[PDB]
Design a binder for these strands. Structure first.
Ligand SMILES: [Mg+2]
Lengths: 144, 147
DNA sequence: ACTACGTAGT
DNA sequence: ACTACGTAGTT
């Protein structure tokens, strides 16, 4: 469970399957968009996320990414501040890097990001959704 | 769609996940336990099976394997398994006497070698619905798997 | 647009 | 036993 850059894995590096990410230690979950662990105080923190179209994420060509939280069937219900969602929230204060893998060879490693903030939105269904603002840490190579 | 031994793939060779099997040409389906094709005459035949715990397969340490058919919600309202697709392929493979690759789950999968399908039968489970069982015997003369 | 012994953590 | 940004081959 590495935080930050993983040996041998360069920005721009591509992969065909979620499990290749698992093998390399990039992203563990087979399916879940968010991977996390415990810190040196047992609070949850985020290590990596996947944005592959599973939700309505905002992936322009900028250093900022809006990542939707997980859950809530997205019969609709409120997303919840536990697990990955929680991990991501905590990662704002912890200011730790988070690997970002983007879907498109179906996945590219996008580099490191910090979680700057989060908020709740209320969708059409009437239920709660989380949104996380991640900014790409400066100084890294660029992905075409 | 190869029948029998696949180049480079030796008995005892291990694999972490199912798509690796697909890549090597060992077992094509992403999820399904049975892989098949059509023969010179367009009848279905089986090429490989996976036994990973998805059902109640009998996997002692012998040359004989009891493999459960697919379907019927058995891995969700119970119903009769049906003699089509893989099940059918496996049935036909009894007469055709062709080898079938066997991959066993446990690095989560091992190649177990080649087997022949010797017979099949129907069982009636508690639910009251039909299930197929296939008796496969390991072809003699192959290396052995540790266990 | 389906069936399907997927698959890694609560 | 459930949760969850998973996949091939349509036989
Ligand atoms: Mg069909």
């Amino acid at each position: 469970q590495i935080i930050g850059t993983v040996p041998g894995v360069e920005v721009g590096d591509e992969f065909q399957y979620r499990m290749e990410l698992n093998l390399l230690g990039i992203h563990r979950p087979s399916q879940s968009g968010i991977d996390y662990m415990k810190d040196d105080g047992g609070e949850l923190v985020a290590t990596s996320i996947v944005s592959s179209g599973g939700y309505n994420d905002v992936l322009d060509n900028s250093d900022v990414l809006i990542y939707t939280g997980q859950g809530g069937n997205v019969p609709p219900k409120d997303q919840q501040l536990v697990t990955g969602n929680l991990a991501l929230k905590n990662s704002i204060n912890k200011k730790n890097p988070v690997r970002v893998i983007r879907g498109i060879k179906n996945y590219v490693y996008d580099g490191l990001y910090l979680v700057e903030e989060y908020w709740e939105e209320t969708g059409s269904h009437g239920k709660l959704v989380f949104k996380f603002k991640l900014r790409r840490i400066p100084g890294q190579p660029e992905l075409p």
